[PDB]
């Protein structure tokens, strides 16, 4: 018998896997399917948090002009997140759209030097390539090693026309002078659902070895790595679209029969070699 614990985990998986801009619909579906609000509240908060986090949910703090990215890296752990740019503390309410009642966050200021350079250096990259994009660079110490984590998010939601899309890119820069190592993952998800369910799910994992110089210098070196890698990724995607449409798709079903005219069903229902 499927225990209530198993049903809760199932409900949680569905909820955290909602496509971009459709969280509520999926949540309401699961809620009515689970049909047990007591069980639903067991993992709700955790579900909401995980979703917004892996979705790089762009949020606007009470009044900073702050579009900041909700990610794990910014998860304080107490129910609050970090805004490395404006550098405050903000409590994110998961149900409601807003996240308010901030707290100043005087920093460690150790890796911040790099952090602050990359951040607004990337902030330029984003404004140049993402129509409705936002970025958040994290300066942090990961078990001794210093790392810069730049997160980029971009989306377009048009539910009235039955479609939504979102871009997510995460670059981990681990410094080990003279030359450092790079690790990233690019992600794209598109959903079209008017009388159907079509989705583009794609992601690319990349690892690079980069030479580390100055502060404003290594930064521009990075924004360059990213720019080239993401342009290459996007390029490979438009190409794939081209082949799928002019080669793969046509190899599946013809537009017209080999006979080159619509089918003569009376002929199919009788016409024989002999018996």
């Amino acid at each position: 018998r499927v225990s209530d614990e198993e049903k809760v985990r199932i409900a949680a998986k569905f909820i955290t896997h909602a496509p971009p801009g459709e969280f509520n619909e999926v949540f309401n579906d699961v809620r009515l399917l689970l049909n047990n609000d007591n069980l639903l509240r067991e993992g709700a908060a955790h579900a909401f948090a995980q979703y917004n986090m892996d979705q790089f949910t762009p949020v606007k703090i009470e009044g900073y002009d702050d579009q900041v990215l909700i990610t794990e890296h910014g998860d304080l752990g107490n129910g609050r997140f970090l805004d490395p740019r404006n550098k405050i503390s903000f409590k994110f309410d998961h149900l409601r759209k807003e996240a308010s009642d901030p707290q100043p966050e005087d920093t460690e200021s150790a890796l911040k030097q790099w952090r602050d350079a990359c951040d607004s250096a990337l902030r330029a990259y984003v404004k140049d390539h993402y129509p409705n994009g936002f970025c958040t660079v994290y300066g942090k110490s990961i078990d001794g090693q210093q790392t810069i984590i730049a997160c980029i998010e971009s989306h377009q939601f048009q539910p009235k026309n039955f479609w939504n899309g979102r871009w997510r890119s995460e670059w981990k820069f681990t410094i080990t002078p003279p030359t450092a190592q790079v690790a990233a993952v690019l992600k794209i998800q598109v959903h079209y659902y008017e009388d159907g369910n079509v989705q583009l799910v794609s992601h690319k994992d990349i690892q690079d070895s980069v030479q580390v110089s100055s502060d404003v210098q290594t930064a521009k070196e990075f924004i360059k790595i990213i720019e080239n890698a993401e342009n290459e990724y996007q390029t490979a995607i438009s190409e794939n679209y081209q082949t799928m449409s002019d080669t793969t798709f046509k190899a599946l079903r013809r537009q017209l029969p080999v006979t080159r005219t619509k089918i003569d069903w009376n002929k199919i229902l009788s016409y024989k070699i002999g018996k």
Binding site: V2, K7, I10, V26, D29, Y192, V201, Y233, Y241, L252
Partner: protein
Amino acid sequence: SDQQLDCALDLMRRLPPQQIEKNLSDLIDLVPSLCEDLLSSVDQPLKIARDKVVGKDYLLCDYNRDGDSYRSPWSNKYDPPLEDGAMPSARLRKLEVEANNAFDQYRDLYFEGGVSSVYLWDLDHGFAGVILIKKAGDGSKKIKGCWDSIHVVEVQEKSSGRTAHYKLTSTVMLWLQTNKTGSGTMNLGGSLTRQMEKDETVSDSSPHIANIGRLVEDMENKIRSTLNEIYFGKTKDIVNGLRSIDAIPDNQKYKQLQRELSQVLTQRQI
């Protein structure tokens, strides 16, 4: 629980179609009483089975299933073996054989390969059937593709007339995938559904199969066009709206304008 089924269908219309199998199973775990209703209303990637006695593949769906076994359209036998599995009447079975043969030709003419399967069943004042077609592309190419056709037709026979009412609900599932260096893993898949109803004359020159065939053909030709548009047209455009390779000539106007319109509500609200 009808809202539940409705909610179950809405959910499958949103979760990644790439995992329909795992998700449908979980969905059933969550609501075991809806198992039968979901297995019949939720379209899933078509599975191939081998008819050993005839040496021919056939497709699996809820409509040729009885318990944990499926009926082959070739040998009219269940696999795994069953004792008293549901079978169409001898007279419907004959029409079923003929429908399979007609659609085999239809499949070869439009898909030049792949597999097809037709299963029929009697209704109170008519009959119904499902036409299944699966076609997978060149397994040697960088990009993999698969087309799944799922046509369910209901035929309402008229007492007087030999004119019948046909209701066709069709779904084409199109799956495209590639594992190339430059793109990593790219999966473009899912399906589109269309429905059609028509009153039609039934005669010796235009029997049931011909009418169903014409409807299926028109339906698939229309869905093929829509698929091309949505998959390679619309999702691509959404993708180009998320990012642009060329620097987007920054626009101050829109931001300046938005500032103006926003303060109107802010300096208007409280």
